[PDB]
Amino acid sequence: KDLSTWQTFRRLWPTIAPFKAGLIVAGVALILNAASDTFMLSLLKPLLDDGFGKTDRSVLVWMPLVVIGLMILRGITSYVSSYCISWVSGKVVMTMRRRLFGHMMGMPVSFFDKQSTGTLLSRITYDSEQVASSSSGALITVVREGASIIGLFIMMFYYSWQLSIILIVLAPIVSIAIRVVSKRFRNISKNMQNTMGQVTTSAEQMLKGHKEVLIFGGQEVETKRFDKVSNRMRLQGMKMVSASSISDPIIQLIASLALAFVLYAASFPSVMDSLTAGTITVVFSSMIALMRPLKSLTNVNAQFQRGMAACQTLFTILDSEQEKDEGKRVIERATGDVEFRNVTFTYPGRDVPALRNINLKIPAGKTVALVGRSGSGKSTIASLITRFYDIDEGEILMDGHDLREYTLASLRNQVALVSQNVHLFNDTVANNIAYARTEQYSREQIEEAARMAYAMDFINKMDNGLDTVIGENGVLLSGGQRQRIAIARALLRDSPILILDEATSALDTESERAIQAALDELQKNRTSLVIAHRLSTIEKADEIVVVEDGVIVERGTHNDLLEHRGVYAQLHKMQF
Amino acid sequence: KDLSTWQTFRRLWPTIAPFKAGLIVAGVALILNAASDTFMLSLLKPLLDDGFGKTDRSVLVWMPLVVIGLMILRGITSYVSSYCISWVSGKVVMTMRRRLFGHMMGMPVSFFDKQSTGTLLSRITYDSEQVASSSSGALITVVREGASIIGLFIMMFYYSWQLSIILIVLAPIVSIAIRVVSKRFRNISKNMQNTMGQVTTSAEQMLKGHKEVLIFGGQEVETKRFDKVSNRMRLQGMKMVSASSISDPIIQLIASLALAFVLYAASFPSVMDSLTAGTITVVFSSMIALMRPLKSLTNVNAQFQRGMAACQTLFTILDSEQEKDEGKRVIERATGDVEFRNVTFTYPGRDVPALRNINLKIPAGKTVALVGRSGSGKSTIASLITRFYDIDEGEILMDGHDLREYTLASLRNQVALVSQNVHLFNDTVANNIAYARTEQYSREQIEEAARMAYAMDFINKMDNGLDTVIGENGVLLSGGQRQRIAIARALLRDSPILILDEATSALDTESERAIQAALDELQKNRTSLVIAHRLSTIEKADEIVVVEDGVIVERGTHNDLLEHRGVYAQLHKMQF
Ligand SMILES: CCCCCCCCCCCCCC(=O)O[C@H](CCCCCCCCCCC)CC(=O)O[C@@H]1[C@@H](NC(=O)C[C@@H](CCCCCCCCCCC)OC(=O)CCCCCCCCCCC)[C@H](OC[C@H]2O[C@H](OP(=O)(O)O)[C@H](NC(=O)C[C@H](O)CCCCCCCCCCC)[C@@H](OC(=O)C[C@H](O)CCCCCCCCCCC)[C@@H]2O)O[C@H](CO[C@]2(C(=O)O)C[C@@H](O[C@]3(C(=O)O)C[C@@H](O)[C@@H](O)[C@@H]([C@H](O)CO)O3)[C@@H](O)[C@@H]([C@H](O)CO)O2)[C@H]1OP(=O)(O)O
Numbered sequence A, B: 001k002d003l004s005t006w007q008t009f010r011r012l013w014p015t016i017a018p019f020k021a022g023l024i025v026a027g028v029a030l031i032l033n034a035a036s037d038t039f040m041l042s043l044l045k046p047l048l049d050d051g052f053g054k055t056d057r058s059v060l061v062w063m064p065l066v067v068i069g070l071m072i073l074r075g076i077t078s079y080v081s082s083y084c085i086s087w088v089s090g091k092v093v094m095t096m097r098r099r100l101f102g103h104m105m106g107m108p109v110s111f112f113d114k115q116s117t118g119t120l121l122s123r124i125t126y127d128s129e130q131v132a133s134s135s136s137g138a139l140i141t142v143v144r145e146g147a148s149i150i151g152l153f154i155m156m157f158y159y160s161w162q163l164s165i166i167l168i169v170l171a172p173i174v175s176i177a178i179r180v181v182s183k184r185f186r187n188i189s190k191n192m193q194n195t196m197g198q199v200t201t202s203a204e205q206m207l208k209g210h211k212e213v214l215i216f217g218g219q220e221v222e223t224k225r226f227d228k229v230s231n232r233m234r235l236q237g238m239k240m241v242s243a244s245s246i247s248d249p250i251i252q253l254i255a256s257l258a259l260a261f262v263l264y265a266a267s268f269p270s271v272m273d274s275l276t277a278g279t280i281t282v283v284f285s286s287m288i289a290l291m292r293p294l295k296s297l298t299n300v301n302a303q304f305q306r307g308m309a310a311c312q313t314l315f316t317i318l319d320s321e322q323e324k325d326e327g328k329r330v331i332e333r334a335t336g337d338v339e340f341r342n343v344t345f346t347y348p349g350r351d352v353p354a355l356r357n358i359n360l361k362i363p364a365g366k367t368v369a370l371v372g373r374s375g376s377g378k379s380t381i382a383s384l385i386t387r388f389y390d391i392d393e394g395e396i397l398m399d400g401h402d403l404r405e406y407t408l409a410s411l412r413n414q415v416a417l418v419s420q421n422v423h424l425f426n427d428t429v430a431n432n433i434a435y436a437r438t439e440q441y442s443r444e445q446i447e448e449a450a451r452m453a454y455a456m457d458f459i460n461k462m463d464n465g466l467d468t469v470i471g472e473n474g475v476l477l478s479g480g481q482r483q484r485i486a487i488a489r490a491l492l493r494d495s496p497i498l499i500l501d502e503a504t505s506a507l508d509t510e511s512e513r514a515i516q517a518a519l520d521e522l523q524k525n526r527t528s529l530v531i532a533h534r535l536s537t538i539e540k541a542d543e544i545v546v547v548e549d550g551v552i553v554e555r556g557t558h559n560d561l562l563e564h565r566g567v568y569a570q571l572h573k574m575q576f
């Protein structure tokens, strides 16, 4: 996927298009600074080379103030240009991060379980930053050196076309060398920024798994892994710098070969050489001045190509497959008649389907309970209900119409659940209870929701009631308190459809039935999808469905299931 | 904590001390390259300024080959020096990451719940990298420009001490300006790399919380937060670049003020000026050549100070308080007679103690069960047993001796538990079951441990048995399978002390009692610390202890507790 530089710069250009004013101001500052420098050199040459005594004293009287003002203008122009190019770079590296965040955040769930969090995070701190160098400063430098080279080429063409033939014949050679060097530079630039994701992943694994890496020993295995990864990154950087330091000698050697050729041509006492001997010095002096522009362009090529490769891979990821959003049907306060018709779902990368012809009905104002073997089909149904994944066959109808027909935001706004592995945010308890809706819900509503979840008992025991930070993933408050806070968060939404995916997994029986009674009393005629391995919490459920290997086994009321004496009664007799 | 530059460079020096060979080779390459450049300029000046006709043809015949070889030597020296400085930079940025990893990984648990994972991870990818620029290249450039400045100062002192007085009188001014500019540069360098941690934390919060940020809406709140954080970072960078572009004009203006003074002095037709008129041109030409070294030093000062501030904060964190390791007593296969004597523990930042005079005994070959109110004292005891935290009063004795007396590695190697919030690693199932000990346990042992945990049933159903990657945090296999894998991991250790912190929290009753029977049969005479909210799984426990508000309430056998008709019987009658 090593795209050509020009055609990816063309795609990068629209991102920098709003900030063309900074670039043009930088350019006008550059030409003004060049004019001021030429003015200063022209006025300084007679004073230095000829001598102070030779120069007139009348102009020398005002010379100090004149030079002070001239260089003050030079410095202000340099400041303006540098600030403008840096501003362009910063504003084009800010938009890149914004787009990466807004695009990766809308990715489907099936994409997040394949990639690692570290390698996704490493593209917002390192991959995006590399475009900054190649966006504005490198482009301006390349344009300036190309203009200088073209000017010197025109000067050679006007002065003497006989001695300029070698530059024409070596231009393919130097162009090919620059092209292969740039392609290689992009290669290591893409490879090295990919292994920084490995660095971030290796760091994150130890950062987020400190407890078990302490408990289970292995204080050296993680160190060895990180050492190998860091050595890989360091050697990638070494390869990049070695290529950078190799590229310059070859271009310089080509230029010196041209120098040797022109010196050898001037060695021959030809009639044209003898008649145009004065022009030989002129062309030699002009060509000896190409060394600096060539060196500057070739040196800045390294940063330009690193940034260009980062841009290439960044636009590669930015054009990935996002979540499906074909359906555009806004629905407000749906009844919640979720119904399944012969839907079979298969997780990506798995040959065996997770669900086989699963069929269940969730009418309005009814609580349905799913039980069965661990890990058979339970959480998968709740995942498909909110469309975390995409169904393969069958049809899932919400309020009589297909889920794919409704817009994603409306569907997610009408479904609120308690995740099996609750991941609380590092913020205040009030902000966590009412997440992403702090401006819509008052403090009284938050307190009432917390009370409905039997969470106000331990909240007041904290240092600051409903205002205490709980750290990363809610480490501060441990165990069942996280589940109670999640229950309060789900209840505060007042969602038409509420799903309890192991609501009381880590809750004692004293508060489990209190929460169940609160749900039964304060949430009457609300569609509920309760999932639990404890049958005692679903004794009053309207109907129970048993899932085993992702298929329908037994459905009906608790008394009907007990009289059936099937799998549900087998589990109930074992639980007692 | 804005430390002075020299005294923190002194502390950074030992890190670069092993790699002094690269620096000295870079220096010798630099002096060789300078000598070659002087040779080339000396031989080229007569050819260019005087003219080709003036120069002898005999030397001009060999001139092309001579110049080719000379510049080839120049290029090879430049390559050697650049590769050496880059190698030094890379090897000094690798060690920094190694030390950060090995130091942050040994931090106490009480430090990890206060900081955010993002801000800790951001110091290994960004904070460490900044030292690379200021370690080798910036130091070499500063040394070279200082040597050049000292040489020009000596040249002025020898040539004319009358006109060198202004440099002496302005040296305090330029030194003070450089000092304040450097201190400010370090200020924004420390401030900006601190807000990159905010960038990483904001990215990580959305990366690791995608499910609930989809479910609970709020597709704009996270975007706004990240937008504000990115704007803060961009404006910090803008401030840094503005200070950088402001610093240069002031130093240049001081130099130009010296230029104006010397021009004004030469304006006066003094007797000394008239007699030494030739020396005026010499000193003016010498001083006009100081502009480039001054500009280069002042420009590289920005990168040097950014790296120096990063080094300052990095050594600040590196000298934090690590885990206590005073005790040095290696113990192999301890009996496990853990006993508590009037120990009261208080979590950091909490006024109310978590445990108040908790007292319990865990003799050899006994299983003790803890029950009670949710979140009272249960997980805290298991945390102190392995010394995740530090006790305040009382004494915890393991095998008759204090925990603090034993070395940390031996104590952790003799305790293996199942965490309440299991966090599986992104690797193969076999590697996760035997974590950090893959070289010590064979495949047969892993399979037997998995079978003991009732985990071999669903393992064979996977695409690759015991060889299938499970993604980040074990997303691939959901719910109870993670708990079964954790149980297998705990069992495979064959640890003398085994703690079950909600072992069957997310497991159905069909496999819960099977796992309990496997533990009872295959782990006879092993010290067990079982913690569960389901009394049915601890019906055969040797003794049960009830924890309520972190104090002892009721201890004894199941029959004794039932006959007591206390809190335990109150819970049992409610569970049935
Ligand atoms: C005056 C003083 C007095 C006395 C002083 C002395 C006393 C003390 C001295 C102090 C010394 C300090 C120590 C130190 O000085 O430092 C160390 C020491 C090294 C000393 C070497 C001695 C050689 C003498 C040289 C002297 C002068 C140079 C550096 C090191 O040792 O770094 C070593 C690396 N770097 C060098 O060697 C450079 C370098 C080192 C030299 C350093 C200088 C210091 C000398 C001191 C003397 C002072 C006196 C003056 O040597 C070279 O160049 C030399 C050859 C050419 C030189 C040219 C000079 C230019 C002049 C031009 C003028 C005309 C080395 O890279 C090897 C290859 O890398 C490049 O690219 P590739 O990799 O091949 O792609 C080269 N290709 C290129 O660059 C190409 C580039 O595009 C150039 C562009 C070309 C331009 C285009 C042309 C355009 C055309 C135009 C015309 C049309 C390629 O070919 C080369 O070089 C040759 C050359 O370039 C090729 C160029 C192509 C030419 C084409 C045509 C040209 C046209 C010409 C026209 C005329 C080279 O072979 O790898 C090992 C580690 O590798 C591993 C390992 O070994 O396993 C691998 C790693 O991971 C792997 C794995 O294999 O496992 C591999 C990865 O894939 C990874 O991804 C994973 C993955 O997953 C897979 O598994 O796995 C892992 O295993 C790990 C181990 O675990 C242990 O860590 O390390 C490093 O070791 P380490 O880091 O130390 O451990």
Ligand SMILES: CCCCCCCCCCCCCC(=O)O[C@H](CCCCCCCCCCC)CC(=O)O[C@@H]1[C@@H](NC(=O)C[C@@H](CCCCCCCCCCC)OC(=O)CCCCCCCCCCC)[C@H](OC[C@H]2O[C@H](OP(=O)(O)O)[C@H](NC(=O)C[C@H](O)CCCCCCCCCCC)[C@@H](OC(=O)C[C@H](O)CCCCCCCCCCC)[C@@H]2O)O[C@H](CO[C@]2(C(=O)O)C[C@@H](O[C@]3(C(=O)O)C[C@@H](O)[C@@H](O)[C@@H]([C@H](O)CO)O3)[C@@H](O)[C@@H]([C@H](O)CO)O2)[C@H]1OP(=O)(O)O
Binding pocket: A021, A022, A025, A028, A029, A072, A075, A076, A079, A080, A083, A084, A087, B173, B176, B177, B180, B181, B184, B231, B235, B238, B239, B242, B243, B246, B247, B249, B250, B253
């Ligand atoms: C030819 C062409 C023809 C026509 C072309 C035109 C057509 C189109 C043109 C295209 C234009 C593109 C757009 C663009 O061009 O770009 C925009 C436009 C800006 C235009 C400005 C017009 C001014 C005209 C100037 C022209 C020429 C320069 C840039 C911008 O606007 O960037 C703005 C920023 N930058 C500038 O302005 C620079 C700059 C901009 C100029 C850009 C040039 C382009 C002009 C075009 C014209 C072309 C024609 C030629 O202006 C200046 O310099 C000018 C004054 C001096 C200049 C000197 C020149 C050098 C010459 C030397 C030669 C002699 C601005 O910074 C403000 C301050 O920053 C610095 O440090 P401090 O912050 O104070 O510390 C300055 N101190 C320094 O540097 C000091 C530095 O050490 C210097 C070193 C000194 C050396 C030491 C001396 C040694 C001694 C030696 C002797 C012994 C300080 O003082 C200054 O400047 C003055 C000066 O320096 C002080 C220096 C000290 C002097 C000491 C003695 C000197 C000795 C002298 C001896 C003789 C200055 O006041 O802040 C806002 C955003 O801020 C917020 C906001 O507003 O709230 C804050 C933010 O967060 C906060 C919060 O407050 O909330 C705050 C934070 O703390 C944050 O941490 C959190 C936190 O948690 C707390 O809450 O919160 C957040 O709120 C956010 C909002 O949410 C909205 O985003 O933004 C930015 O806006 P934004 O980014 O756009 O949004």
